[PDB]
Design a protein around this ligand. Structure first.
Ligand SMILES: CCCCCCCCCCCCCCCCCC(=O)OC[C@H](CO[C@@H]1O[C@H](CO[C@H]2O[C@H](CO)[C@H](O)[C@H](O)[C@H]2O)[C@H](O)[C@H](O)[C@H]1O)OC(=O)CCCCCCCCCCCCCCCCC
Ligand code: CLA
Ligand code: CLA
Ligand code: CLA
Ligand SMILES: CCCCCCCCCCCCCCCCCC(=O)OC[C@H](CO[C@@H]1O[C@H](CO)[C@H](O)[C@H](O)[C@H]1O)OC(=O)CCCCCCCCCCCCCCCCC
Ligand SMILES: CCCCCCCCCCCCCCCC(=O)OC[C@H](CO[C@@H]1O[C@H](CS(=O)(=O)O)[C@@H](O)[C@H](O)[C@H]1O)OC(=O)CCCCCCCCCCCCCCC
Ligand SMILES: CCCCCCCCCCCCCCCC(=O)OC[C@H](CO[C@@H]1O[C@H](CS(=O)(=O)O)[C@@H](O)[C@H](O)[C@H]1O)OC(=O)CCCCCCCCCCCCCCC
Ligand SMILES: CC1=C(/C=C/C(C)=C/C=C/C(C)=C/C=C/C=C(C)/C=C/C=C(C)/C=C/C2=C(C)CCCC2(C)C)C(C)(C)CCC1
Ligand SMILES: CCCCCCCCCCCCO[C@@H]1O[C@H](CO)[C@@H](O[C@H]2O[C@H](CO)[C@@H](O)[C@H](O)[C@H]2O)[C@H](O)[C@H]1O
Ligand SMILES: CCCCCCCCCCCCO[C@@H]1O[C@H](CO)[C@@H](O[C@H]2O[C@H](CO)[C@@H](O)[C@H](O)[C@H]2O)[C@H](O)[C@H]1O
Ligand SMILES: CCCCCCCCCCCCO[C@@H]1O[C@H](CO)[C@@H](O[C@H]2O[C@H](CO)[C@@H](O)[C@H](O)[C@H]2O)[C@H](O)[C@H]1O
Ligand SMILES: CCCCCCCCCCCCO[C@@H]1O[C@H](CO)[C@@H](O[C@H]2O[C@H](CO)[C@@H](O)[C@H](O)[C@H]2O)[C@H](O)[C@H]1O
Ligand code: OEX
Ligand SMILES: [Cl-]
Ligand SMILES: [Cl-]
Ligand SMILES: [Fe+2]
Lengths: 169, 39, 31, 39, 334, 51, 63, 32, 30, 56, 341, 37, 78, 38, 35, 31
């Protein structure tokens, strides 16, 4: 791709200059992200075609990889419930597929195109860096406080377990 | 006073500063009396 | 003293690699 | 396929003052962090 | 035409790459002396009995220190304020044991920095400049004299001088809080306002100038190439900067005068550092920071604590632990 | 002793600052450039370069 | 610009650069979806923070 | 107590004395 | 032998100071 | 946690930097050589809007 | 003319106090923060969270008042007024320290609003947004210190309290419990802040002492006009002065001012990185080589080991009153102390 | 030690003399502006 | 040079401003005074008066320990 | 359905009705009344 | 000439000044509270 | 294995220093 930089795909057929339709690129990438998210939830984590994920007892004595059924109730928003992680990936994958379709089909408003400078790839860099640090703060928090996705047999116990005498009790 | 319908601005500043130093002096008096005076 | 066994190599590389980057970029300037 | 020359190439510069600033920054960062690397 | 007039013309010459001047005739020898002795002592000096209790503290790199922990340890408490040059020691090893290199380095350094201030005046005079850069440099000089000279004089021992090292500096700060409550001293509070505000105003000024630079380059090259050294024109739009900052807060909070703004930039951290240097210099005579321990009592007379009382508990911890074999008597009076 | 010593140390320091300010200004005013550098006869513009 | 078979398949997916809907378009519906997303993030944050307690589970390793 | 009443009265008289001199000189146009 | 590394980094800083003063880019009015 | 907390905080600067460079791309090499009447106080009813001149 | 553009016209009118779109975030939140501070330090106690008086109503002064941090029993509960602790009771909300997350979160959003205001006014005036980029330093310090540090700890209790002596307590706490002076991230912050103060002082003095004589008064301040095109001071004379005094000098004014930005902002960002480390007790507490040597050889003493002893004493003597929820009963015989003190 | 003391006393006296006699050698006249005084 | 509002020096030197603010600023001052001196501020913010830091049945600091039921805890603390 | 859930829903309603909605209404009103003549 | 009385600047000035004077009167009353 | 304690730093420097010399001289070529 370095040597053969000058592909016609990358040039607007109206002008002669290089151009990337960033909204259409977003639709395609969001559709595919939605497909991969849905598949990872529905096949891998459920065990339908896949191994599932690490689950354990509350005291980290019997940790093993097992298929996990999704939890569609409010207990799907318990961060220590692995069925919540499966539901997330099915529902957010479905929503990503639907949002991908919208973004593949509907052009941006002119107000949003000019306001967010959608002809500039640096706007994608700015918003992507923003989403990426949001996600990094989230993974730092769920690592530090504990989660179904950060089991103590894999990463060690938390400081709050020592703080409250969780294991002592 | 002197100015017609207009109090001089330096008089306003003198009165406001005298009031400001008065309330600051009251707070420094209250450091030595009542609550927070250690007696 | 019972120092870290990787301390010397970490210190020399931590100094040397950006020193090399700056020297490379300075000497080629004017090309 | 042809291997056409890229027009987006630009020379990189680092002037002598920037080199001195960078070398000083690198040296003082080594001075600062070497004790912690040795621990 | 005389040899002395030729030497006077060379010493005061504006053509020298480093200006010497008559203050430089004192500064160069003293600073070189203190620099040489400091480097040698920081690398290789034997341990120093700083507290005078035959418990020598190792300060040099060769005796097990790193860069952070290394120091040129202050002279012995047994010496006190006594003058201890090399020739008053019976051997060099005794001079090293008693912390003589500290006295040598400090005394030469302090002469050197006072002559550095005078040299700043001197070059400003030879260049036809206004002379008050040395007045601004008097604030770090006052702080250095406060910690290396004035606080030892007030406490009666160079052993109480700030050590010439990083962790020794931290030890000095912590023991100073234990003994003086410098955090609760309104002059340190002005120092902190001086350095915090000086950094704030450094960032605002730099940000406002960089924000308002005149377009003179492309976005390929660095914007700094839009300035030519010696150019007559101004490189940024002060009116744009003022029109930004007087809408950020309000119009009359913003400097429209560059001279007034630059004066304020000079004056604020200089005044703050002057105040905190006088705080340390007055805490030398143990005029300490504010004591609000048990200031609040309930109607019965039971103490209601504040944050000052918790701070006092922290100060106690430091105090009862510092120089832990030095004290024989119930009060730390100096 | 504490009040008198602290007061006079601080007074002494600020009077050294005042000495530097008035000595420097006396020197510049007697030499004629206390109000700033004259643009035409700026002395650095006639000096050789340092390096 | 060199043509390639894949580039010819992928070409209509990079052919509408700069094409906009005039005016505000679908921005009100977008703002509604952002408001619902903010409410969702508030819900899951307050569940994790234990500021929002619901029946049927407890935010704990046992659940 | 009446001591602090007199202290404040003497202080208030002394405080008004200076601005009184300034005010009579400004009101009558003296050599300000 | 950690002293060797400390002496080296301090010597590098001082040598950079010497070369940055004695062989600086000279300021020129153009 | 450390790595990802520190990177997340540094990536906040990157957002602000690249967001700024996106929104302020026309002045990245510097402001317009005029900009004298546009920034003055009270001349225009709206800040920066040239069509809202008071002429008063 | 649609309603959005009419509202944009009204919000961006030239008036004594610029509002903008960002003011809708900035002006309520900041008013919630500062007033929430001013209320707390005037009226609200910390007696049930800390066992301390922290208001003017209780007799504390400006140095000793605070909006103190909440009780440690709440953990990192956001402590909404309507939340499951206060349950809408205003008085109980004040007593449990709900004013601390009120001021800290409204302050966070207000700081966001202020940075957005910097961006908005920079765009409307027509300048580059480097004031906002410089203001990221204070946001990094606020976010690391007041939010990320207690979030790594047990509760909001160990966050700094919004007061003078409460901040001093937090400072001494990080000394004795974290050895935060020994942290290179802090040392870089100190270098940046002292360097920024140095740069402020030296640049202001250099400009004021290389001024061109452009007027007749000894008052040199009126020899400047904001619409003038020429520099008011000699860059050439300043450069020659500092080249002969110090060895080097600025030759480029643009690099000078960018450096004046760069030094304290980089200092703030580096110290924020260190505070994020302290959130997880990832301290630069010890040099293990010097500890092992001192453990095996009781003649070896450095200033580092002396500071370790200082921290030990401060921890043992401060912890029962500073952490009253822990019920630390330390008898007098277990407290470390030197001879005769 | 005595030889060192005499040498240091001589060196310090020579540098201090230079400073005093240098500033006594019409140093107001050594300035780029007016030098009548 | 002026955004359009009345200048502050023209306002605070006017007779009407002082007629109004000669009443409004003392009324706000004595309103804050009566907020404290009637004891209303104590009950409003839950701040103890100098005789309620400790009771006859509690001589220790009333440090909160319950996660949720703090109303009952504070009542018990009195 | 819990008391904390009810309080959260009331927090949404009162955050709209106390802060968001009258600020929105007053801003729209004062913008449409105090317009700029171009 | 014919300046408006009530402005955004008016609301800004009073939003701070009015509880400022209220609080200052409160702290002044606080100075006379006895133990 | 009980290897020489200086073997790693000697190997890395023995490779890295002439590598740096060659890279410096190559990148500046054409000046
Ligand atoms: C950037 C610049 C832009 C500026 C932005 C300014 C915006 C500010 C608004 C953000 C406010 C967010 C507050 C988050 C509150 C929180 O976190 O509250 C914490 C809760 C978790 O609660 C804690 O959980 C701990 C562990 O509990 C677990 O373990 C316990 C003992 O074993 C028990 O078993 C318990 O039942 C079980 O739940 C303890 O219980 C604590 O007491 C409890 O408070 O997480 C949660 O709500 C959510 C956790 C996931 C989200 C994390 C995002 C925040 C990042 C945090 C980084 C954390 C650590 C790194 C530090 C560095
Ligand atoms: C902080 C110290 C300090 C500094 C930097 C200056 C600086 C200045 N003085 Mg001042 N001076 C000082 C203190 C100082 N003075 C004190 C305390 C007095 C009262 C005794 C004077 C009395 C004085 C007079 C009478 C005059 C000046 C003048 C001046 C200016 C011209 C330089 C000159 O003639 O040298 C004078 C410098 C000195 C007299 C002392 C300098 C002290 C240096 C900085 C350190 C000394 C260390 C010491 C010599 C070494 C230790 C010795 C020991 C180890 C053996 C210059 C701005 C002249 C001027 O133009 O004024 C308008 C002038 O005529 N000074
Ligand atoms: C723009 C300004 C602004 C912002 C960003 C915040 C932000 C915040 N406030 Mg603050 N607040 C503000 C202004 C602001 N406030 C003002 C002006 C006041 C004074 C009245 C307060 C008084 C206040 C108190 C007393 C408290 C807060 C609290 C909080 C925090 C939690 C808020 C929350 O969950 O609300 C959730 C609500 C919303 C997000 C709004 C609803 C949004 C949805 C999408 C719309 C709902 C539509 C609704 C169903 C329609 C029905 C309306 C009607 C027709 C029936 C948060 C940091 C709490 C705090 O600090 O905790 C420590 C707290 O206890 N605020
Ligand atoms: C030479 C001495 C020295 C110096 C220069 C510094 C310098 C610094 N220290 Mg250190 N400190 C020292 C010694 C020193 N320290 C010692 C010996 C200790 C003991 C261990 C500490 C303990 C210490 C702690 C515990 C912390 C620092 C921190 C800091 C940084 C503070 C940055 C700042 O301005 O925050 C000020 C705050 C801000 C910039 C936040 C935003 C401020 C907003 C904008 C204010 C808005 C106000 C609003 C407009 C209205 C206000 C009005 C109201 C006041 C009435 C800075 C790098 C902090 C740090 O590292 O942070 C990352 C920190 O948490 N220090
Ligand atoms: C130019 C502007 C000037 C404006 C004038 C304003 C003056 C207002 C000042 C103080 C207001 C109260 C006065 C003190 C009350 C007297 C009570 C008493 O006798 O003692 C009360 C207490 C102890 O009370 C003791 O009681 C005993 C038995 O009753 C005896 O009476 C003793 O004599 C008495 O000392 O002592 C003090 O508190 C005195 C210290 C405080 C005095 C004023 C503090 C500082 C005041 C002003 C400085 C402010 C500076 C801010 C700005 C500075 C820059 C300009
Ligand atoms: C604390 C402070 C609070 C601050 C609040 C102040 C106001 C904020 C501004 C909001 C701006 C939002 C987008 C801009 C408006 C817009 O899209 O264009 C304005 C549009 C179209 O304008 C119309 O458009 C027409 C055609 S076209 O659509 O533009 O092509 C055109 O003919 C016509 O002239 C024109 O008016 O007008 C509308 O139709 C208004 C619809 C409502 C706005 C949508 C916002 C979504 C938020 C929902 C929140 C509640 C959801 C509940 C969740 C639990
Ligand atoms: C109390 C309400 C005032 C708050 C406010 O927003 O003032 C903005 C405007 C008034 O000032 C108006 O607003 C403008 C100034 S500004 O918008 O306040 O910045 C000004 O252009 C206009 O002539 C002026 O009448 O609010 C009003 O329209 C209320 C008119 C005052 C009469 C009732 C009081
Ligand atoms: C909390 C809260 C809230 C809020 C509120 C608010 C927001 C308010 C406020 C408030 C305020 C806003 C207050 C105020 C104040 C003030 C003050 C307290 C002042 C002062 C001062 C002073 C005392 C000064 C002095 C001085 C000095 C020192 C210097 C010089 C001189 C003078 C005099 C100026 C609400 C209800 C919503 C809800 C609940 C919670
Ligand atoms: C409680 C409300 C707030 C109160 C705050 C009051 C602050 C006032 C402090 C400033 C004091 C300055 O006081 C004022 O200063 C200006 C400065 O040129 C002087 O100068 C003035 O002279 C005359 C009036 O005498 C005017 O025509 C002239 O335009 C004006 O410059 C005034 O003679 C003086 O009265
Ligand atoms: C300018 C300063 C601003 C700071 C705030 C000043 C306001 C003064 C404080 C008044 C406190 C009133 O005192 C307290 O008020 C709350 C209201 O929230 C009441 O609270 C009651 O109603 C609320 C509303 O549904 C319930 O959720 C709550 O469970 C119940 O106890 C308490 O019964 C009362 O004891
Ligand atoms: C931009 C974001 C800004 C948002 C922040 C602004 C502040 C938001 C205020 C939300 C306050 C909610 O406060 C909550 O209100 C509800 C409704 O009265 C109260 O609820 C109470 O009254 C309702 C009314 O019938 C009863 O049904 C209920 O049983 C009772 O508990 C809660 O006791 C109180 O805690
Ligand atoms: C150029 C400017 C002026 C510089 C010239 C000055 C030259 C040196 C003058 C003094 C140096 C020697 O001066 C001499 O020092 C020795 C110190 O060993 C002092 O000696 C003193 O201490 C020694 C200890 O060593 C004792 O043995 C001796 O009994 C005692 O008097 C002498 O009392 C003093 O006269
Ligand atoms: O030496 Mn140095 O620290 Ca002044 O205080 Mn007493 O001395 Mn010792 O003790 Mn605490
Ligand atoms: Cl010690
Ligand atoms: Cl003793
Ligand atoms: Fe400048």
């Amino acid at each position: 791709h370095w040597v053969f930089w000058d592909l016609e795909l990358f040039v607007d057929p109206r002008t002669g200059e290089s151009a990337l339709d960033l909204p259409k690129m977003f639709g395609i990438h969001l559709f595919l992200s939605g497909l991969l998210c849905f598949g990872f939830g529905a096949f891998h984590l459920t065990g339908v075609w896949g191994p599932g994920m690490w689950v354990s007892d509350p005291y980290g004595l019997t940790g093993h990889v097992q298929p996990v059924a999704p939890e569609w109730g409010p207990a799907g928003f318990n961060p220590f419930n692995p069925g919540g992680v499966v539901a997330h990936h099915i529902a957010a994958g479905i929503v990503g597929i639907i949002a991908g379709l919208f973004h593949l089909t509907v052009r941006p408003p002119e107000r949003l195109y000019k306001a967010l400078r959608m002809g500039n790839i640096e706007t994608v860099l700015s918003s992507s860096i923003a989403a990426v640090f949001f996600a990094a703060f989230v993974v730092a928090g769920t690592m530090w406080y504990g989660n179904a996705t950060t089991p103590i047999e894999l990463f060690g116990p938390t400081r709050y377990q020592w703080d409250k005498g969780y294991f002592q009790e | 006073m002197f100015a017609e319908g207009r109090i001089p601005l330096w008089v306003v500043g003198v009165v406001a500063g005298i009031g400001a130093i008065g309330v600051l002096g009251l707070f420094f008096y209250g450091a030595y009396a009542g609550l927070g005076s250690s007696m | 003293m019972q120092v870290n066994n990787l301390g010397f190599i970490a210190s020399i590389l931590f100094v040397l690699v950006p020193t090399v980057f700056l020297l490379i970029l300075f000497i080629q300037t004017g090309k | 396929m042809d291997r056409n020359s890229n027009p987006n190439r630009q020379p990189v510069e680092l002037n002598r003052t920037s080199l001195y600033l960078g070398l000083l920054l690198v040296a003082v960062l080594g001075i600062l962090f070497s004790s912690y690397f040795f621990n | 035409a005389s040899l002395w007039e030729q030497f006077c013309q060379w010493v005061t010459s504006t053509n020298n790459r480093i200006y010497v001047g008559w203050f430089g005739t004192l500064m160069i020898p003293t600073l070189l002396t203190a620099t040489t002795c400091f480097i040698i002592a920081f690398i290789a000096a034997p341990p120093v009995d700083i507290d005078g209790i035959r418990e020598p503290v190792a300060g040099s790199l060769l005796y097990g220190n790193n860069i952070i922990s290394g120091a040129v340890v202050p002279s012995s408490n047994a010496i006190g304020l006594h003058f201890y040059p090399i020739w008053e020691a019976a051997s060099l090893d005794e001079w090293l044991y008693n912390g003589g290199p500290y006295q040598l380095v400090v005394f030469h350094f302090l002469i050197g920095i006072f002559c550095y201030m005078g040299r700043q005046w001197e070059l400003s005079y030879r260049l036809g400049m206004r002379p008050w850069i040395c007045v601004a440099y008097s604030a770090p000089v006052s702080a250095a004299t406060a910690v290396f000279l004035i606080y030892p004089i007030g406490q009666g021992s160079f052993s109480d001088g700030m050590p010439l090292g990083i962790s020794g500096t931290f030890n000095f700060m912590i023991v100073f809080q234990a003994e003086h409550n410098i955090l609760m001293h309104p002059f340190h509070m002005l120092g902190v306002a001086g350095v915090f505000g000086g950094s704030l105003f450094s960032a605002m000024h730099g940000s406002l100038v960089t924000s308002s630079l005149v377009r003179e380059t492309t976005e390929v090259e660095s914007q700094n190439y839009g300035y030519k050294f010696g150019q007559e024109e101004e490189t940024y739009n002060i009116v744009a900067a003022h029109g930004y900052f007087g809408r950020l807060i309000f119009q009359y909070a913003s400097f429209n005068n560059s001279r007034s703004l630059h004066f304020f930039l000079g004056a604020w951290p200089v005044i703050g550092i002057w105040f905190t240097a006088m705080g340390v210099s007055t805490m030398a005579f143990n005029l300490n920071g504010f004591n609000f321990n048990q200031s609040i009592l309930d109607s019965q007379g039971r103490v209601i604590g504040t944050w000052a009382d918790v701070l006092n508990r922290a100060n106690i911890g430091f105090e009862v632990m510092h120089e832990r074999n030095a004290h024989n008597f119930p009060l730390d009076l100096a | 002793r504490a009040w008198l010593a602290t007061s006079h140390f601080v007074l002494g320091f600020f009077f050294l600052v005042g000495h530097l300010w008035h000595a420097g200004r006396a020197r510049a005013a007697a030499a004629g450039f206390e109000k700033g550098i004259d643009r035409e006869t700026e002395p650095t513009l006639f000096m050789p370069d340092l390096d | 610009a060199q043509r390639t078979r894949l580039g010819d398949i992928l070409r209509p997916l990079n052919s509408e650069y700069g094409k906009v809907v005039p005016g505000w378009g679908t921005t009100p519906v977008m703002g509604v979806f952002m408001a619902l997303f903010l409410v969702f993030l508030l819900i899951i944050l307050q569940i994790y923070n234990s500021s929002l307690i619901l029946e049927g589970f407890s935010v704990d390793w046992a659940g | 107590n009446l001591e602090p009443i007199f202290q404040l009265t003497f202080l208030g008289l002394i405080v008004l004395a200076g601005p009184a001199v300034v005010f009579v000189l400004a009101f009558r146009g003296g050599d300000l | 032998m950690e002293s060797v590394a400390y002496i080296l980094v301090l010597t590098m800083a001082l040598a950079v100071l010497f070369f940055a003063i004695a062989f600086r880019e000279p300021p020129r009015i153009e | 946690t450390f790595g990802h907390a520190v990177f997340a905080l540094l990536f906040f600067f990157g957002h602000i930097w690249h967001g700024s460079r996106t929104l302020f791309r026309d002045v990245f090499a510097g402001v317009d050589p005029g900009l004298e009447e546009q920034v003055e106080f009270g001349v225009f009813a709206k800040v920066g809007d040239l069509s809202t001149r008071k002429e008063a | 003319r649609g309603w959005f553009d009419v509202l944009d016209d009204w919000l961006k009118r030239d008036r004594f106090v610029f509002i903008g779109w960002s003011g809708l975030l900035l002006f309520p939140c900041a008013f919630m923060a500062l007033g929430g501070w001013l209320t707390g330090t005037t009226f609200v106690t910390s007696w049930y969270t800390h066992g301390l008086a922290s208001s003017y109503l209780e007799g504390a002064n400006f140095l000793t008042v605070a909006v103190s941090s909440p009780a440690d029993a709440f953990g990192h509960s956001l402590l909404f007024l309507w939340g499951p602790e206060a349950q809408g009771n205003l008085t109980r909300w004040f007593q449990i320290g709900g004013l601390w997350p009120f001021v800290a979160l409204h302050g966070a959003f207000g700081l966001i609003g202020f940075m957005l205001r910097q961006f908005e006014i920079s765009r409307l005036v027509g300048i580059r947004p480097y004031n906002a980029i410089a203001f990221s330093g204070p946001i990094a310090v606020f976010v690391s210190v007041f939010l990320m540090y207690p979030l790594g700890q047990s509760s909001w209790f160990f966050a700094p309290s919004f007061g003078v002596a409460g901040i001093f307590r937090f400072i001494l706490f990080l000394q004795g419990f974290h050895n935060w002076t020994l942290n290179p991230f802090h040392m870089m912050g100190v270098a940046g802040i002292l360097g920024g103060a140095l740069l402020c002082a030296i640049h202001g003095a250099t400009v004021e002492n290389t001024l061109f004589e452009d007027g007749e008064d000894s008052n040199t301040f009126r020899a400047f006009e904001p619409t003038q095109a020429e520099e008011t001071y000699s860059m050439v004379t300043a450069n020659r002065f500092w080249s002969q005094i110090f060895g080097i000098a600025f030759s480029n004014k643009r690099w000078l001012h960018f450096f004046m930005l760069f030094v304290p902002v980089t200092g703030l960002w580096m110290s924020s990185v260190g505070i994020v480390g302290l959130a997880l007790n990832l301290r630069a507490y010890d040099f293990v080589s010097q500890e092992l040597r001192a453990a095996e050889d009781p003649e070896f003493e450095t200033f580092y080991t002396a500071n370790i002893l200082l921290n030990e004493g401060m921890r043992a003597w401060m912890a029962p009153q500073d952490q009253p929820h822990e019920n630390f009963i330390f008898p007098e015989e277990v407290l470390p102390r030197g001879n005769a003190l | 030690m005595l030889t060192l003391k005499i040498a240091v006393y001589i060196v310090v006296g020579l540098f201090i003399s230079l400073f005093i006699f240098g500033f006594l050698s019409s140093d107001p006249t050594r300035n780029p502006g007016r030098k009548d005084f | 040079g002026t955004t359009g509002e009345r200048p502050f020096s023209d306002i605070v030197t006017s007779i009407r401003y002082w007629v109004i603010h000669s009443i409004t600023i003392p009324m706000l001052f004595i309103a804050g005074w009566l907020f404290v001196s009637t004891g209303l501020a104590y009950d409003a913010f839950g701040t103890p008066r100098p005789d309620e830091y400790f009771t006859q049945t509690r001589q220790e600091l009333p440090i909160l320990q319950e996660r949720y039921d703090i109303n009952q805890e504070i009542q018990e603390f009195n | 359905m819990t008391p904390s859930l009810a309080n959260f829903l009331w927090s949404l309603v009162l955050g709209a009705a106390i802060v968001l909605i009258p600020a929105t209404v007053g801003l729209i009103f004062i913008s449409q009344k105090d317009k700029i003549t171009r | 000439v014919t300046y408006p009385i009530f402005t955004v600047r008016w609301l800004a000035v009073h939003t701070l000044a009015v509880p400022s004077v209220f609080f200052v009167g409160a702290i002044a009353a606080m100075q006379f509270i006895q133990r």
